[PDB]
Amino acid sequence: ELIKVPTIPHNLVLIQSDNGKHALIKEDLGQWPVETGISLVNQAGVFAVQLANKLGIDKPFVLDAGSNYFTDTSFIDTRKYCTDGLSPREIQKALNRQRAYYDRPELTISENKTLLSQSIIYPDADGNDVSIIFSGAMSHAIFTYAQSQWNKNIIKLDDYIREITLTVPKQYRPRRFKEIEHTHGYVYRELNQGSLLPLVDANLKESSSYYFKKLMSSISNVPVDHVSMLTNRLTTANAPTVRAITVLTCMFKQFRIGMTYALDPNIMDVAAATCMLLFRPAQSISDEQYRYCLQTMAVFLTNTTYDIVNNDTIDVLKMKLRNQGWPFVERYNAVEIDMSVEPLRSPGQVGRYYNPFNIDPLTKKHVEDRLEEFINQVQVGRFRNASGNAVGTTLAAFLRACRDKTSANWRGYSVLVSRYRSLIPNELFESLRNISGEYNINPQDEHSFFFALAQINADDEFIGAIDKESAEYLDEYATLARDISNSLTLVKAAFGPLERTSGSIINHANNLNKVINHVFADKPLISETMLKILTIDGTTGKDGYRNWLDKLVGHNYPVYVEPVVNIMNFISARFVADSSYFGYTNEIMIMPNHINVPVDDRFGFRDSPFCTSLPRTIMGNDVRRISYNVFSMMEDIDDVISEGFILYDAYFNFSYDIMTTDGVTRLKEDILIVTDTGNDIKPIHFYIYFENRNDKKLRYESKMNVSYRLYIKTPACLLPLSDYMRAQHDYVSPSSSRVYIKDPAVVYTRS
Amino acid sequence: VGRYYNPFNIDPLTKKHVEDRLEEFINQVQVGRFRNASGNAVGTTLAAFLRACRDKTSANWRGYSVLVSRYRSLIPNELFESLRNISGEYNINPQDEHSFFFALAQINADDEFIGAIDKESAEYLDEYATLARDISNSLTLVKAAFGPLERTSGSIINHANNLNKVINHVFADKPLISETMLKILTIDGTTGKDGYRNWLD
Amino acid sequence: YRPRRFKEIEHTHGYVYRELNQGSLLPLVDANLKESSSYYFKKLMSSI
Amino acid sequence: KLFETSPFDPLTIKNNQDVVDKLYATQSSSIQEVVPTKTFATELQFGVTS
């Protein structure tokens, strides 16, 4: 849901002396500690999220500031006066006091009116309202950039409908939006689809097992409405399980199924083998299973042994069976039916599914046009004996019962396959495979399934249950895609390549544990859905994630850069680039008091510790530069510090408070501490006072009491009061006529 | 500087098994027929066990690779070159070998490492320098106190055993000498009379 | 790396006693280590 | 410590047979490449006695 921000964060404070001579404006973005010796960008990212939270730009938002205005009492003035930002009255008072010190005339009525009308709200052509207010530079830059990133995912409702119009079926009642929604409706949606392939490819067995078991639990709940050996073995105990396998074979591509026969085949095993080859897709039967089925029929019908046909090829087995009089030696490809709509999570793609029982939808019969002729062949065949025709007649009668059952019930099963197929995306259709053979069919269950085929009843309860599953599947896929993106970003930033050295292996293992322990603390980064996928093999979810992350190192998978990543990258870059805004610097200078160094005189400070830039040369000679590590290790620091130097190669955190009175500008603590181990710089805190230029006591105190001074570059947050026009910044707020739709669904759930 | 075979035949660069056809090979076993001409579960059972062994091996090779590195860090150089002269064959029961791989235990040493430094291994290896100084000091003192040694009567085993007792008595103020000499005799004496002769040499 | 400094008096009138003999481990390991290796290995696995 | 349990205390051995007997006694503490059990004999002959 979009957040509607009422006010603009300006972060401006006005500091003025008691005399009124000097005033300044400061941005207060806070103090952020920086540690030396480690990467600055890595610390910047952590501080970027906190800064975004402070400014209120972490979550998607729009600005509602067009109602924050008033109107002047003058009849000529019809302008709108914005109430956001630093108030122009405060600047007027600060300027008012400054003129009092200088014995100058007060601000005139015309000059007052110009100043008090600097903050205005006016509308543009598009209907948006732009507010011109006094605000800090860094806050304006970050806030405006965040607006640009979030507005990319705000589109008109009619634009959203066009994107998803190819995924809406024809069994759902269209939703009538109100007239206001159609003209002024807007929705915030992310339209980028993330691939589930990285997780599926890395763990094919676990991903396949998870989805296969989920689908079977749903399908198994669908409502439905020599001869002695065949007739004594019928059981409908596992018919719901066989039914789910049938739907799975047709809804997927290459879902291999397997049957295991007994050591000594009988008429039931031959019946099951024939039913498998006749009424199941060829895409779901492997070559080895095809050979096993041919061998089983050859063993029984020809009265041979498994040893004789163990070395026989497919063509040889077909020749042997055809000579005896058995024509059922072929497997048949199923006929693919195209889905009426584009499948979910498959943009610009066409989905397809096999028609059950190898029934051609055009002819509404079996794909084998010789089926009736073949059954007559079996009925007049002499198998396993010299005469009697007991086996042929029994198999002919059993085959005819299966043929009528499949012809009557093909429409019902085709509807079931089509509805469950719409649940899975195209990537899962083409990638998931049956590994470990964790679903198999007993030969008795197969021939009982086709002899006692049950019609499919689609009650209102079943339709409602499936619609609930569709919502659950959509959320599950969306959650998985997000966690894949999060994992891919984490691996790229935190891991590198491996080497055949002990140090590299030790380094990788320690880093992997540190990452894993961090991502599972507090609220886990990874969702419970994928933890279920990785735990399905019995391993701990924490261990499974560690294994998956290691596999992902060095991937070339493309990851879409989302708006939140763009926002933090902007804040991180400005954190490094403009360090003075955030209270740290990379260079300080220590000089004796008798050395005159040029400083920043804009603010009227007494002995200002701020220089516009640290001088390159002092007294005609370049200033010495020493790194912090060498400085810490020095033993002759007394001799070096007598001439003054510049310290760099470290991140110096500093603080200051500007006092309105007049006094001796100094530091809270001493500059350095000398120990037998090394020398360090104590925490830096400046007490800055404004100067009266004629106080002899304070002039003497500054020259004689303090002997050494510390100089840093002038912080960019400070800005003299005279340059208050530099804080004038613009902000655009979208029109108030827009309506944001929380539920952008286009159809209802009813037949 | 040393070398060691990576555990479980895994290449760190590839992060997989050395054989590049393992996935194809396992699927071949699953759809195969073994030990019978008729159908059986031999192919499927072996495929399931092979997959579990492969998955554990890829999951836990990092911990065992670190373990070998830590163990070798404890061995000084002179000891390692001496141990390279010996050889042996270890016999493992088939039940133990399969149970070890099927029930592989994850090994973690994150708490043992401070950054990239293993404190316990560093201090343990440093103690060999103290032992090296003690060995040299003890041998020189015995040679000075007891000059060339002669055996007019008795056995070599009795000659060396009784000499150690006199060393303990003569150097009772410094018990380290006898302790160090008995350490060398313990290693040498496992071979018997020939080992005792080497100690005297 | 450098050593930490001592007191002022210790750096002017300071004296220490030291021995430079590093020694060697060869006498301990110059033997037929076949029989004793198994016992050494058991201690090695017990160190970690 | 080179050994957690010494193979044999040298002061207690008097001859070669003493070393082998002690080594057999303390072999459980070592990492045996073969773990002993009952022995299998494939040859046995009995000579005539007095």
Question: Could you please report the per-residue DSSP string of A487-519?
Answer: HHHHHHHH-----SSHHHHHHHHHHHHHHHHHH
Nearest to D19 among B155, B187, B192 (CB): B192
Q: What residues contact residue B31 under an 8 Å CB cut-off, 6+ apart?
A: A286, A288, A289, B43
* Cα distances (angstroms) measured from residue A494 to each of A43, A511, A516, A545, A561: 13, 8, 11, 15, 17
CA distances from A227 to A392, A624, A706 (A): 11, 107, 116
Smallest Cα distance from C8 to chain D, Å: 42
Which residues lie closer than 8 Å to A317 by C-beta, 6 or more apart? A291, A294, A295, A298, A309, A329
Cβ–Cβ below 8 Å for D4 and C41: no
Torsions phi, psi of B114, nearest 5?
-100, 105
Residue A315: count of CB within 10 angstroms of its CB = 8
Measured in Å, how far apart are chain D's first and last C-alpha atoms? 55
Q: Which of A607, A596, A611 is nearest to A663 (CA)?
A: A607
Q: Which residues of C touch B74 (CB under 8 A)?
A: 44, 47-48
Question: How many CA atoms within 13 Å lie on the side-chain side of A140?
Answer: 19
Q: What is the rounded radius of gyration, in angstroms, for the C-alpha atoms of chain C?
A: 21
Contact by Cβ (8 Å): A330, A280: no
Can you tell me the distance from the alpha carbon of A280 to that of A355, in angstroms, rounded to the nearest whole number? 10
End-to-end CA distance of chain C: 30
Is the CB of residue A626 less than 8 Å from the CB of residue A647? yes
CB–CB contact A677 C5 (8 Å): no
Contacts of D39 (CB under 8 A, 6+ apart): none
Which residue type, as a one-letter code, is found at position A517?
A: N
SS3 of chain D: CCCCCCCCCHHHCCCHHHHHHHHHHHHHCCCCCCCCCCCCCCCCCCCCCC
Measured CA to CA in angstroms, residue A651 lies from A320, A587, A647, A681 at distances of 86, 8, 10, 12
The amino acid occupying position A159 is D
Alpha carbon distances (Å) from A35 to A112, A586, A589, A669, A681: 48, 12, 20, 20, 14
Give the whole-angstrom CA distance, residue A581 versus residue A53.
17
Q: If you ran DSSP here, which 8-state letter would residue A449 be given?
A: H
CB B46 within 8 A of CB B29: yes
Cβ contact, residue pair D30, C38, below 8 Å: yes
Q: CA quadruple A177, A182, A188, A193: dihedral positive or negative?
A: positive
Tokens matching residue A517:
């322990």
Among A503, A537, A550, whose Cβ lies nearest the Cβ of B15?
A: A550
Closest among A317, A324, A278 to A301, alpha carbons compared:
A324
Of the partner residues B135, B186, B188, the one whose CB lies closest to the CB of residue C25? B135
Q: B158: which chain D residues are within 8 Å (Cβ-Cβ)? A: 14
Cα dihedral A694, A695, A700, A702, rounded to 10, equals: -90
User: What type of residue is A243?
Assistant: R
Inter-helix orientation angle A541-552/A502-519, to 10°: 130
Between the CA atoms of A159, A160, A162 and A166, what dihedral angle is there, to the nearest 10 degrees?
170
Subunit partners of chain C (3 or more CB pairs within 8 A)? A, B, D
- d(CA A691, CA A604) in angstroms, rounded, equals 6
Asked whether the beta carbons of A432 and A426 are under 8 A apart, the reply is: no
Cβ–Cβ < 8 Å for B144, B137: no
Other CB atoms within a 10 A radius of the CB of residue A81 amount to 17
Q: How far is CA A52 from CA A44, A139, B180, in A?
A: 12, 10, 68
Whether the Cβ atoms of residue A395 and residue A267 lie closer than 8 Å to each other: yes
Question: Whole-angstrom Cα distance, residue B98 to residue A73?
Answer: 93
Contact residues on chain D for C48, CB-CB shorter than 8 A = none
The residues near C4 (Cβ < 8 Å, ≥ 6 apart) are A676, A677
Helix/strand/coil percentages in chain B, nearest 5: 60, 5, 35
Exposure class string for A10-49: b at 16+ Cβ within 10 A, else e: bbbebbbbebbbbbbbbbebeebebeeeeebeebbeebbe
Amino acid, res. A680:
D
Q: Which amino acid is at A730?
A: D
Q: Find where tokens 């201090």 sit.
A: B123
Question: By the 8 A CB rule, do A290 and A314 touch?
Answer: yes
CA closest to A543 among chain B residues: B59
Residue labelled with tokens 């009492």: A73
- CA angle A88/A89/A90 to nearest 5° reads 90
Residue B194: CB atoms within 10 A of its CB come to 12
- HSE-CB of A362 using CA atoms within 13 angstroms: 4
CB-CB: which of D3, D10, D33 is closest to B161? Answer: D10
Question: Is there a contact between B74 and C36 if contact means CB atoms under 8 Å apart?
Answer: no
Q: What are phi and psi of A32, to 5 degrees?
A: -125, 115
Question: CA–CA separation, A35 vs A41, rounded Å?
Answer: 11
Among A607, A597, A611, CA closest to A644: A597
Distance, CA of B129 to CA of C28 (rounded, Å): 13
Sign of CA dihedral A740, A743, A744, A748: negative
Distance CA A43, CA A579 (A): 13
Residue with tokens 């500007």: A658
Coil, strand or helix: which one is A283? helix
Q: For residue B143, report the phi and psi dihedrals to the nearest 5 degrees.
A: -65, -35
Secondary structure, 3-state, chain C: CCCCCCCCCCCCCCCCCCCCCCCCCHHHHCCCCHHHHHHHHHHHHHHC
* 3 state SS of B164: helix
- Cα gap A54→A48, rounded to integer Å: 10
C-alpha distance from residue B145 to each of A704, B149, B159, B196, D23 (Å): 76, 11, 16, 20, 33
Model resolution, angstroms: 2.9
Residue B43 CB partners (closer than 8 Å, separation 6+): B29, B30, B31, B32, B33, B34
Closest CA to A199 of A449, A487, A455: A487
DSSP letter (8 states) at residue A690: B
Nearest CA in chain D to B182: D10
**What amino acid is encoded at D45 in this protein?**
Q
Give the closest residue to A560 by CA, choosing from A624, A616, A505, A486: A486
The CB density around residue A724, as the number of other CB atoms within 10 Å, is 21
Tell me the two tokens of residue A283: 């895409």
Residue B99, min C-alpha distance to chain C (Å): 20
- Closest residue of chain C to B196, computed from CA coordinates: C31
Q: Do B189 and D15 touch (CB under 8 A)?
A: no
Residue C17: phi and psi, rounded to 5, are: -110, 130
State whether the Cα torsion A140-A142-A143-A148 is positive or negative: positive
> What is the sign of the dihedral through the CA atoms of B89, B93, B98 and B103?
negative
Minimal Cα–Cα distance from C24 to chain D, Å? 16
Residues from A in contact with C at Cβ < 8 Å: 676-677
| DSSP class of A600 | -
Counting CB pairs under 8 A, whether chains C and B reach 3 or more, is yes
Residues in a beta bridge with A188: A154
Measure the CA–CA gap between A147 and A567, rounded to whole angstroms: 9
Mark whether D and B touch (3+ CB pairs within 8 Å). Answer: yes
B neighbour chains, 3+ CB pairs within 8 Å: A, C, D
Supply φ then ψ for residue A460, to 5 degrees.
-65, -30
- Kindly list the distances between the CA atom of residue A688 and the CA atoms of A17, A580, A655, A717, A719, in Å, as whole numbers in the listed order: 11, 17, 11, 15, 15
The SS3 call for residue A587 is strand
| C45: chain B residues, CB-CB within 8 Å | 71
Q: How far is CA A128 from CA A5, A83, A153, B145, in A?
A: 15, 18, 18, 105
Cβ–Cβ contacts within 10 Å for residue A277, how many?
A: 21
Residues of D in contact with C35 (CB under 8 A): 7, 23
State the method: cryo-EM
Determine the Cα–Cα distance for residues A106 and A96; give it in Å rounded to an integer. 7
CA distance A614 to A591: 12
Using a CB–CB cut-off of 8 Å, the residues of D that contact C are: 1-7, 23, 26-27, 29-33
Pairing relationship of beta strands A684-689 and A645-659 according to DSSP bridges: parallel
Q: What is residue B36's three-state secondary structure?
A: coil
**Which chains border D (3 or more CB–CB pairs < 8 Å)?**
B, C
Give the end-to-end CA distance of chain B in Å, rounded to a whole number.
32
CB A64 within 8 A of CB A6: yes
What tokens appear for A382 in the block? 């002499």
Return the number of other C-beta atoms located less than 10 Å from residue A385's C-beta.
10
- Amino acid in position D12: T
Place of tokens 């970690």: C48
Query: With contacts defined as CB-CB under 8 Å, which chain B residues touch A491?
Result: none
Query: Please, are residues A117 and A132 in contact by the beta-carbon 8 Å criterion?
Result: no
Order across the sheet with A154-156: list the strands: A154-156, A185-188, A739-740
Closest of A423, A215, A458 to residue A339, by C-alpha: A423
Q: Which residues of B touch C (CB under 8 A)?
A: 67, 70-71, 74-76, 78-79, 82-83, 85-86, 88, 120-121, 124, 128-129, 131-137, 139, 183-184, 186-188, 190-191, 195, 198
Query: Quick one: tokens of A291?
Result: 């050979």
- Encoded tokens for A448: 């009982």
Q: Exposure pattern of A660-697 as b/e (b: 16+ CB <10 Å)?
A: eebbbbbbeeeebeeeeeebebeebebebbbbeeeeee
Radius of gyration of chain D (CA): 16
Torsions phi, psi for B107 (to 5 deg):
-120, 125
- Rounded-to-integer distance, Cα B140 and Cα B171, Å: 13
Identify all chain A residues contacting B65, using CB atoms and an 8 Å cutoff. Answer: 502, 505
Asked whether the beta carbons of A264 and A229 are under 8 A apart, the reply is: no
Tokens of C30: 């110059």
Partners of A259 in the β-ladder: A441
Contacts of A665 (CB under 8 A, 6+ apart): A605, A606, A607, A608, A609, A686, A687, A688, A689, A702
Under 8 Å between Cβ of C15 and C23:
no
Name beta bridge partners: A709. A591
CB contact (8 A) between residue D33 and residue B90: yes
**Which residues from chain C sit within 8 angstroms of residue B86, using beta carbons?**
33-34, 37
For residues D10 and B161, is the Cβ–Cβ distance under 8 A? yes
Pairwise CA distance, residues B77 & B75, whole Å: 7
**From B88, B185, B192, residue closest to D16, measured CB to CB:** B192
Q: Give A83's contacts (C-beta < 8 A, 6+ positions apart).
A: A68, A69, A70, A119
**What distance in Å separates the CA atoms of residue A121 and residue A129, rounded to the nearest whole number?**
6
Interface test with D, best of C39, C41, C42, C45 (most D CBs within 10 A): C39
In 3D space, the residue among A559, A558, A574, A600 whose CA is nearest the CA of residue A686 turns out to be A600
Q: CB of A747 within 8 A of CB of A164?
A: no
- Which two three-digit tokens encode residue C36? 């004793």
Cβ-defined contact of B15 to A286 (cutoff 8 Å): no
Nearest residue, CB atoms, B189 vs list D3, D10, D14 = D10
Q: How many CB atoms within 10 Å of residue A710?
A: 19
SS3 content of chain A, % helix, strand, coil (to 5): 45, 15, 40
Instruction: Return the closest-CA partner of residue B38 out of A317, A391, A302, A291.
Output: A291
